[PDB]
Subunit: 214 residues, 4 copies
């Protein structure tokens, strides 16, 4: 079935310091929306809690003409993994790996994040981030079981400026895609992240809308 609820476990290190967060949420796979809450298990985070965004489930994402490949993967009892690399404008780098397990309509996500190079006086380490702009991702097919995308992410800072990152994503599926499915590309997805956070807990309310053309 399509997902209804999920658990999340984020862990790894940022600038050489380990962090760990656990939580979960729920979503509407018909609307492409979801909510996720994560709480630290090692006390206050040493970096902006917003760095955990957009990391806080494309299994909730439908396409204009039916379930997305991500949803079909879950429905058919298959699976996929997610790999991303964030190249921040000030030298910071963040690499991520997401793995999932399914139990009925409940998803369990294990997310490993490794970040480094964030200036100690930068927006991340000094928690200057206050929001993030809506964003459009571009998805295309690579090989026969991989979807690749790119997006230019931008956080909003207290001073009104923006903090940017060039992002690349690779979604690797355990089962190959059909020939007709691969004819439908690129696929664009507009997403907006509404966040509420503290030094120990972060909550994301994500909205998504995919389109082939406008």
């Amino acid at each position: 079935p399509l997902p209804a609820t999920h658990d999340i476990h984020l862990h790894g290190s940022i600038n050489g310091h380990e962090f760990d967060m656990v939580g979960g949420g729920k979503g509407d796979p018909n609307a492409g929306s979801l909510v996720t809450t994560a709480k630290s298990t090692k006390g206050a985070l040493k970096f902006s809690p917003y760095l955990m965004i957009p990391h806080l489930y494309y299994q909730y994402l439908p396409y204009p003409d039916g379930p997305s490949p991500f949803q079909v993967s879950m429905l058919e009892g298959s699976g996929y993994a997610v790999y991303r690399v964030f190249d921040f404008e000030d030298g910071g780098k963040l690499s991520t790996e997401f793995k999932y397990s399914y139990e009925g309509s409940h998803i369990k996500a294990d997310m490993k994040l490794m970040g480094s190079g964030f200036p100690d006086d930068g927006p991340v380490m000094t928690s200057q981030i206050v929001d993030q702009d809506g964003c459009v991702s571009k998805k295309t097919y690579l090989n026969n079981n991989t979807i690749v995308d790119s997006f230019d992410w931008s956080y909003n800072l207290q001073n009104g400026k923006r903090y940017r990152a060039r992002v690349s994503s690779h979604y690797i599926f355990d089962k190959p895609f059909s020939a007709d499915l691969m004819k439908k590309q690129p696929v664009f997805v507009y997403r907006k992240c509404h966040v509420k956070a503290t030094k120990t807990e972060v909550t994301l309310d994500e909205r998504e809308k995919a389109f082939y053309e406008l």
Copy 2:
């Protein structure tokens, strides 16, 4: 007034070889659509004619809730210049400069393109390009008179693969002035080694969710 017709002059060099094209077209500033035809004045192009895409007028682009800054600029009798840098996946680089002059609803565009580093056996120099994917650009404001954007451009090749370029655009206005502003565009092209025609469609949006 808003634009209705335009003429174009593209010139410069690709891999050290000069090229020159002239032509024009028209468009619908209420729909964001336009057509442009350019013909070489120096014989057959030595590189893929598709390299002239998307270079073949945002004055035809309306925004989600009214005229775009590009249109407002023209309506008020002001202007802007366009600068882009295309970073191709195989090392090729393309720098462009667009300047305009207006006469009523007619636009005259001068476009200078300087490209280098394209492998002689690559898709550009061996004309492997056959089409280009629809594309979404992300626009934000900088300083008091500049709009900046980025987009990941991708051509479709004869062999079924794609040929990508990371693109940056800077629109500098002559006078000081909701973001980001996204724009979906699709280019429909018909080309030969001496003439290229573009039918462009555009649709801007602030948000879809």
Copy 3:
């Protein structure tokens, strides 16, 4: 003491397929040279064995005016971790994390590599790589305990062409650097990798020479 011998354990996944290699080698910390041999523990590698290069120990690297920060770290009983991101020209991405432990002059290295987006018909997955060009890395200081570098890596292919990657490195130390040490930058390092490999075993003979100016 300075290192004399080392063990290596590389593991992770490339394009969604797990791999694991173990081995080790020795080096000359006075010359900046070293040799490392790694052998697969899961049979033949599904990707070019050269992808394991340059991953196969800056503790062997001296500077023109004395032991490098990497060597001093080991000598003083401290330590550092290494994080890299390889951005390949054809979309491939490789993120790495190296951690070390020391026992006298013997180093134990645990290397985690996560790669994705390599085209199935590309030089990596079809093993077209036959060598790699000499390379110069540029090192500068960030914060008070991090060294950052960049280098433009290039493999040589059978057809005579090259396969490039833009690389970023972050070396995070457990102890902060002195003020005078940080005045000495950038530091450049020329390195050449001499490799011999098979689908199951790879051997690297690395040469290095650092300089502040020429």
Copy 4:
């Protein structure tokens, strides 16, 4: 013959504002060193004078085992053009074009620089730059008449930080022709808002180990 003296003319625009500088200098083609002085012809520059660095002649550059291709080109009465793209960490972009003419051992250089997207409060527009780090460029060959290079440029700021740019260079020769070839360079600069002087040192190498 190898070069001994040169004149320079830099022009173009930065963030939509035109600039123009003229001057010249000399160098030692056996040592790879040279000096260049350029003075503004349009009053004080509106951006950091250091932005004119490293733009202020590889004809003075020898290689590890003999004259460089840049020198061979000049000696044989041929020539080459230089195209660079600077991708600055804060969004600024700079595209450059250098063309030369020779008269014996004297070189005349025409340099066009087009820059945009520099934040008005950034290090370039507020003149925060005070120096630049030594730098190593990596050169490789492409096609039959091009040399391509890359280098990670870094300016030093008044506040102690660095301001970086990812740079790509394409040297296109008029006629067809050991790699990579690395070149360490250091720029010693003295500048004011109207005049900039560069003392450049260069040393190429194929390998050091």
